[PDB]
């Protein structure tokens, strides 16, 4: 009943676009120690993705300004320290999530499906830290992201249908990590092409509940392939 | 100096869509006690309107959910509403106090006096959207600000000036939503549009885009309120 209230508040926060409140509610649900339902973990990930997402978006705007103000010493320094302040919020949010994942989510995940969900998330938030790390710190963070994604990739390959949104979403993100973080466009294309083609091969495995998410993520996989070829 | 870089920072927060940082920068500028320039007061206006705007938006959503659910899910929505109202009131109070203490006293030109009285009118009006009493006192404070704003601008500014037009736009809305007088809202809006249309030669290259945008909004409201 308490947890059910926290969840109702999270949905309320979501509708009012108050993502800090939504994330605070779902983190409390998480810290009660029980395995999250599908809806709860979906809410937890929506909330935190919006919270970290605002910093990432801010970080890219500020970086672009810091580069394009190369000749103006004062303007460019102000940008560097604004960027650094954003990076600090960003790392704190990433650490908050990664810590929830290690302490509650991953070790208690009793289904392949939720193990893959939480490991994807781990691969994701280390990816977000790798986006703003340097330079020897960056190396171990890149490694943490790749291991989480690699384990999730292996479980999903073994336990989940190719058309499952979580399995597709992991392929999508893991392909993005190769392209963006390890500068490996060909590995990225290979990963995404395989996930796309394997889903195309097994289109009878979509259910009425899954398909809209699956087909969206397939389209995204092929959008990236298109982009990354030309 | 300090001021010049708080402003540059404000501009950087804005491009990053970090409006709490933008407002906090522009609040510090204001608190230094010197008259704001046009750019500075526009940045102050944009920062706080975004900060308060997020609360009003959230408020309309939650309050609507609450009104649609009759009997204890209702309670939850109500207490969330009230928490949002408090944020919103704190923000408006913060602004109204900057207006009274720093901005309205130092305004040396009609243009900028009208600007601040329009702001004062707007922030009292946001307090009004969310008041119940108490409310009568708040509405009156909004009305008196917009009225003085409206008198000064009629005497000192061209009908196409963006500030004068925007004041007419918000005062109009105040009549409509707050005082529940559709006819007076339409008459304020109609006169402001028609007077600008008759004097389009008074548009500057610097101003015309703002002016014509508010003209469109004035008419759009008039359309909505009659049709």
């Amino acid at each position: 009943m308490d947890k059910n209230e926290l969840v109702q508040k999270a949905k309320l926060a979501e509708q009012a676009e108050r993502y800090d409140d939504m994330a605070a509610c779902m983190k409390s649900v998480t810290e009660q120690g029980a395995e999250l339902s599908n809806e709860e973990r979906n809410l937890l990930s929506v909330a935190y993705k919006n919270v970290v997402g605002a910093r990432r978006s801010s970080w890219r705007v500020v970086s672009s300004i810091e580069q394009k103000t190369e000749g103006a010493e004062k303007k460019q320094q102000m940008a560097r320290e604004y960027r650094e302040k954003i990076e600090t919020e960003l790392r704190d949010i990433c650490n908050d999530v990664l810590s929830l994942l290690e302490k509650f989510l991953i070790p208690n995940a009793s289904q392949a499906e939720s193990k893959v969900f939480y490991l994807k998330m781990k691969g994701d938030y280390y990816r977000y830290l790798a986006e703003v790390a340097a330079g020897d710190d960056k190396k171990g963070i890149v490694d943490q992201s790749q291991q989480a994604y690699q384990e999730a990739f292996e479980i999903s390959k073994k336990e989940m249908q190719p058309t499952h949104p979580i399995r597709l979403g992991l392929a999508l993100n893991f392909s993005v990590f190769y392209y963006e973080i390890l500068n490996s466009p060909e590995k990225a294309c290979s990963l995404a092409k395989t996930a796309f083609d394997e889903a195309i091969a097994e289109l009878d495995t979509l259910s009425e509940e899954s398909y809209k998410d699956s087909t969206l993520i397939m389209q995204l996989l092929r959008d990236n392939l298109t982009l990354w070829t030309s | 100096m300090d001021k010049n870089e708080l402003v540059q920072k404000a501009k950087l927060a804005e491009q990053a869509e970090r409006y709490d940082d933008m407002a906090a920068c522009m609040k510090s500028v204001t608190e230094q006690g010197a008259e704001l320039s046009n750019e500075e007061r526009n940045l102050l206006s944009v920062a706080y309107k975004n900060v308060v705007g997020a609360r009003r938006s959230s408020w309309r959503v939650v309050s609507s959910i609450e009104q649609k659910t009759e009997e204890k899910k209702q309670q939850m929505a109500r207490e969330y509403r009230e928490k949002i109202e408090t944020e919103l009131r704190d923000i408006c109070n913060d602004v109204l106090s900057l207006l009274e203490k720093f901005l309205i006293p130092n305004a040396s030109q009609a243009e900028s006096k009208v600007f601040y009285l329009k702001m004062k009118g707007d922030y009292y009006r946001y307090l009004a959207e969310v008041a119940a009493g108490d409310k009568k006192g708040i509405v009156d404070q909004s009305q008196q600000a917009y009225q003085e704003a409206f008198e000064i601008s009629k005497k000192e500014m061209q009908p196409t000036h963006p500030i004068r037009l925007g004041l007419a736009l918000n005062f109009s809305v105040f009549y409509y939503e707050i005082l529940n007088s559709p006819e007076k809202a339409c008459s304020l809006a109609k006169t402001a549009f028609d007077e600008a249309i008759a004097e389009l030669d008074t548009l500057s290259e610097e101003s015309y885009k703002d002016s014509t945008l508010i003209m469109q909004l004035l008419r759009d409201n008039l359309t909505l309120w009659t049709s």
Binding site: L172, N173, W228 | K49
Partner: peptide, 17 residues
Amino acid sequence: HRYSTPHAQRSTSTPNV
């Protein structure tokens, strides 16, 4: 519906509703 005065390719990962 009534207006007051207004305010004013890269890789795709999994979106957020």
